[PDB]
Amino acid sequence: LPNITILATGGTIAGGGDSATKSNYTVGKVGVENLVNAVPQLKDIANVKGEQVVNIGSQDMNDNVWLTLAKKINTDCDKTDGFVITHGVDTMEETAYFLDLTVKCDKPVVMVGAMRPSTSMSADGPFNLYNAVVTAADKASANRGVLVVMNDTVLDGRDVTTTNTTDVATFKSVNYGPLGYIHNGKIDYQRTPARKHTSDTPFDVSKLNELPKVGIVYNYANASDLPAKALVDAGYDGIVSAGVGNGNLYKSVFDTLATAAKTGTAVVRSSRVPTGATTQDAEVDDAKYGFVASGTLNPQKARVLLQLALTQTKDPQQIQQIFNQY
Amino acid sequence: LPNITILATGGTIAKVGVENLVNAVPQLKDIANVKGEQVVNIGSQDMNDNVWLTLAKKINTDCDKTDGFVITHGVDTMEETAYFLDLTVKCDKPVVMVGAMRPSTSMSADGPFNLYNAVVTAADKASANRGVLVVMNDTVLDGRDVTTTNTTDVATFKSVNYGPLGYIHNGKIDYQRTPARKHTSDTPFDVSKLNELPKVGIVYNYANASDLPAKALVDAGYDGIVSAGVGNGNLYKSVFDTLATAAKTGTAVVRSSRVPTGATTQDAEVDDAKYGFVASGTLNPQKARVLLQLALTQTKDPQQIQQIFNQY
Amino acid sequence: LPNITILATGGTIAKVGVENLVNAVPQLKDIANVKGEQVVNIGSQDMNDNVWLTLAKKINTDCDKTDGFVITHGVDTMEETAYFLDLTVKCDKPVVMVGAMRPSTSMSADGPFNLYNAVVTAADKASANRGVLVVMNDTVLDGRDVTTTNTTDVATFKSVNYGPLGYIHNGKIDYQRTPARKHTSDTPFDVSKLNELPKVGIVYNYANASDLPAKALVDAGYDGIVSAGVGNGNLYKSVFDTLATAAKTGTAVVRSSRVPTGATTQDAEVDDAKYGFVASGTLNPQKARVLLQLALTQTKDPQQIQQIFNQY
Amino acid sequence: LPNITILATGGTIAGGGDSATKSNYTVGKVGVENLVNAVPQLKDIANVKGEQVVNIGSQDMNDNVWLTLAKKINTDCDKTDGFVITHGVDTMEETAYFLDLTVKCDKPVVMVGAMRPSTSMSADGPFNLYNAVVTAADKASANRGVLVVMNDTVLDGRDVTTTNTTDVATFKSVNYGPLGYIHNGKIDYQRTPARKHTSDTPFDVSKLNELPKVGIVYNYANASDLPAKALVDAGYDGIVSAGVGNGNLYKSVFDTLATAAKTGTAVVRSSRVPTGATTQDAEVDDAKYGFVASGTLNPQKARVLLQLALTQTKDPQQIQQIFNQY
Numbered sequence A, D: 001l002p003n004i005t006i007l008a009t010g011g012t013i014a015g016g017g018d019s020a021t022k023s024n025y026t027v028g029k030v031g032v033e034n035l036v037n038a039v040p041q042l043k044d045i046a047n048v049k050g051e052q053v054v055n056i057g058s059q060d061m062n063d064n065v066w067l068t069l070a071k072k073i074n075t076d077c078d079k080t081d082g083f084v085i086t087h088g089v090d091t092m093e094e095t096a097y098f099l100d101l102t103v104k105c106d107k108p109v110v111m112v113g114a115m116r117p118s119t120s121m122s123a124d125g126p127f128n129l130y131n132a133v134v135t136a137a138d139k140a141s142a143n144r145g146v147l148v149v150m151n152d153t154v155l156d157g158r159d160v161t162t163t164n165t166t167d168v169a170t171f172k173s174v175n176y177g178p179l180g181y182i183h184n185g186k187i188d189y190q191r192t193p194a195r196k197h198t199s200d201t202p203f204d205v206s207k208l209n210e211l212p213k214v215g216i217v218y219n220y221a222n223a224s225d226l227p228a229k230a231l232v233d234a235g236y237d238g239i240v241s242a243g244v245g246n247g248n249l250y251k252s253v254f255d256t257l258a259t260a261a262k263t264g265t266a267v268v269r270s271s272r273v274p275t276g277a278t279t280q281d282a283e284v285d286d287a288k289y290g291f292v293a294s295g296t297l298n299p300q301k302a303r304v305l306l307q308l309a310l311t312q313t314k315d316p317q318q319i320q321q322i323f324n325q326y
Numbered sequence B, C: 001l002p003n004i005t006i007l008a009t010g011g012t013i014a015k016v017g018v019e020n021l022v023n024a025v026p027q028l029k030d031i032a033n034v035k036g037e038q039v040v041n042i043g044s045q046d047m048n049d050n051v052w053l054t055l056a057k058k059i060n061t062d063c064d065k066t067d068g069f070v071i072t073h074g075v076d077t078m079e080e081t082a083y084f085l086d087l088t089v090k091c092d093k094p095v096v097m098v099g100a101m102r103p104s105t106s107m108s109a110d111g112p113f114n115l116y117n118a119v120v121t122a123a124d125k126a127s128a129n130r131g132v133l134v135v136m137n138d139t140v141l142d143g144r145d146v147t148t149t150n151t152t153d154v155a156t157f158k159s160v161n162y163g164p165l166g167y168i169h170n171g172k173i174d175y176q177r178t179p180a181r182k183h184t185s186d187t188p189f190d191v192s193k194l195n196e197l198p199k200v201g202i203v204y205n206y207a208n209a210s211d212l213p214a215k216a217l218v219d220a221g222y223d224g225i226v227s228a229g230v231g232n233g234n235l236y237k238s239v240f241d242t243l244a245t246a247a248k249t250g251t252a253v254v255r256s257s258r259v260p261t262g263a264t265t266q267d268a269e270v271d272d273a274k275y276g277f278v279a280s281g282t283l284n285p286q287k288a289r290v291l292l293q294l295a296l297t298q299t300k301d302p303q304q305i306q307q308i309f310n311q312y
């Protein structure tokens, strides 16, 4: 049976409340040892080894925990057959994409969380962790990049997002669909992401102790420019726009970001809209303003790529190329 | 034949004038006597408080002069205007908003049959007392739950939490649902003598989120801040600290979510009562902003604002 | 505390007896006084007219003896029973159906919290006069639009055309919708002295479809045949010819669709009036069968059957 | 500009009614020449050549039109750069899967239809046909198997199905998602079907003048066995069950199909449920009864594979293997 490392980071999968029934809970309060011991059947599929990297709600996920995870996976690659990462739901789609672009270990890297605390009735965490180990132990899971395994489904780290605030079925690859489905401990894979990931990206974080500063500003009717101005005034390396419709910007926000672009801030148009590409050749002249179109990457995922892009280049054309390949 | 007023505001369905739009669909004469008046001609990315105020007042004033309203509008903020009119219009005659994903000049342009189906809906008396509607892709959607789900799909508009009110086939609607939340003339919001709305801003949550956006709104003395939280409306610690402060310093704070479906609930990870925060329910950030603006024309009390978020 | 009767019928949520199921969720005592009675213990793949009849009569008879009903049932035909009870139950006290995708013995078993949420729903007086409900995956679904969308997903149950009535969080439901179609005590269907229903069969359409299934139903003298058509309820020519004949020989014919969402409409490719066929609207084949069976306890007239399909 | 053959088969894309407004229309009433001439902009992307194979509603699609299409594509492969197939919506998902298993031409084969007649306001047919030509002319569309292009999206023939009776957005790959999205005449491909198709299947129809007889029976509460009995009595080579939930059968239907199986009828459990696999190792002992599990293949698609399987073998274990690879 293969050797599988759980790296624990916290999340509701490690959460607890005073009632099995009430919705109230506090996050990252349970050790990895406890999560493992709640899944007795893990022994039938893997030799499991828990390490506790941090114990936080993923609402508090940050650059430093991203660098710690990537370096640790890359360092320990030769020491194990696979990784599972216990992690909160809230920013899982961000961590998952960061590790998909930075880890050079082509052995299965599987992220897993839970929508209901360990303490709740019909808790989802136990079977999720069982299914994440299944996936990490599966030879066919190798060379697919970093994965998220929730509700019996294997999702690629690039497309995967959380679609509902409470539903155990929340995680979906809303543009290009899942990679495979798990039934009775077995996976039928029918898809692998074409976009370049892991050992095919030039992004190497092994030496990095910080990441370029990238902010996200929201567009809506009568949008204030003040949030954009604050990011520019703090000398942010990049700004991602959560645009309306096909990545459009309220006029005030537009003007601030056009200005910033001219002083060498990187500016990526994304969209607040939950599915579909922010395209070139729409209502915005990107090449004129020195803006980048995010494609299918939602604002939080575009931040992930823009940060790593800013470690290679500050040129809008080369950042546009990066957004077309990764 | 019903009298139906088209108020035009712009969007991709049109620079093209109100009268061209109508003339492009001679079949409208089959179903209504339509008058078109131009209110603005802008991209809905540039929609604003002033246009909202113009629209509410024009529909309220002109209610008794027509049998129905169609509002031609951009797709990008259609869901914001629709909810704003939903809460401020006192006309319970049908008010139908319509747009298009493709221009008039494009292959298989959606604008024509959309406008036709939006006049069918405005001409149907069964459409009365359902609040403000969005009609797109042969579907009748309530102004509260309706949102754009895709950047380019003609089928983008969906009521993603509670579903459509009705489907249009052969110029007829089978209506099987109506919004339970209080709308139009069952709301206390009265905008007839208002010339501006409270200043409400939206800040985004993500990993390593800056508190600078939230600080810049507090520094401006914004009336309100909506959080597009992560998951069930949760806040990155820096943003949590800045909004905790905001809430006890005369800024109403609403927790919404960047997650496209489901409620931001009470009784999860956040003690709303302890911070004086309001949980948005199924209102996404831009919709929460609409209702927070209007709640602040009545009150600044976090408890009274939360009751508003529970009723409308 | 509400009195709530659980009628158990089997399914994966259970061979396990009614009283084990309850005892497995001691938290039920927090929200209701629950009595469990066993009605059958079968897989819902083996659900049948007799069980339907037992259930309608038991709920109608016992309505005045309890505050609410929960029916534990298999997932596979849950959507058929739910609609049948929706049209035949005269009790407008809450009637809630519940199942599970995973057994009691499985990791992260869904059965417990499902039963808990199904008792919350049956105990909520706001659940009254909404017709027969299905509560699965923290969602309250109307018995007419609800269907299983996935072979193994715990989130399988959806009201795919008109959306849910409400979401359950922390034992509380925000109800924002109610089915407009006539249900329970607003229907003329009365099954109290019926011991069998008319024989209705379902035939499938596809490329090169055999007419033999449809002929075997006609040869049996079936009371009715539902077509699971292709697209907008269209029929392979051989099947069209056999059902054209059926319809003028004392077999009611309903055009439904194998397509999982949308209405089978009139006024498309098929002259329903010329063939004496009925268009099912949003009723999928197995639901159309429910309503065709009950329509045939009142009438055989294709026009009167179509009016039924337009009202219920 | 590449040489693209339209093969026309009819469907609503070639349909007409007496009103642009009314929903009433008759199918397959317009010639290919007319469809081409309604899309003036086709000249900018392709040298188009129309041939009219048949003019029928796809509700009347049949084995003989399937054999005619496959042999014609395979015969003409060397004569063109790509194929588009104008076809009705109703059974497109069936034809698309049949051609995906039988055509040996690895040049783009693209199917296209329309939900609104040519005569209707905002007809979808014109832009669909433009987008199907774009896809057929795209070099990257080669070696992806047979495609369906509707509503700006490229779908693989295996997973693609129609999900709504009237909606122009109806066609979706409901299990594994689309292959790419078309914006402004350009496609970003992120997926290719893993299941074997075209020149990697052993199915060769070049000599065939008929197909094995396969029927579909529907399960529901109180299901009659009479439809199953009629198929068995007519000596059908196979029967597909549209099962309830995870491919379950009403007891009467079960008994008839178990019996048939024992006399060498092939029996495949599918599901009436619109998404998810009909799995092995559930409520049915398949190996005991000599039944086959359809996996993600809906009943009409399982008929397609079962017919072609029955041209190689009558053995339930080998048919199960075929359902695991194609």
Ligand SMILES: NC(=O)C[C@H](N)C(=O)O
Pocket: A010, A011, A012, A013, A027, A056, A057, A058, A059, A087, A088, A089, A090, A091, A113, A114, A115, A116, B231, B234, B269
């Ligand atoms: N379900 C969850 O894990 C939510 C939690 N706030 C987290 O992201 O850590």
Ligand SMILES: NC(=O)C[C@H](N)C(=O)O
Pocket: A245, A248, A283, B010, B011, B012, B013, B042, B043, B044, B045, B073, B074, B075, B076, B077, B099, B100, B101, B102
């Ligand atoms: N299709 C559209 O309407 C997009 C446009 N930017 C608008 O919202 O006005």
Ligand SMILES: NC(=O)C[C@H](N)C(=O)O
Pocket: C010, C011, C012, C013, C042, C043, C044, C045, C073, C074, C075, C076, C077, C099, C100, C101, C102, D245, D248, D283
């Ligand atoms: N999960 C389930 O309930 C499936 C089972 N065959 C039933 O419907 O009874």
Ligand SMILES: NC(=O)C[C@H](N)C(=O)O
Pocket: C231, C234, C269, D010, D011, D012, D013, D027, D056, D057, D058, D059, D087, D088, D089, D090, D091, D113, D114, D115, D116
């Ligand atoms: N839209 C369509 O094409 C429907 C038509 N009955 C067909 O399949 O030919």
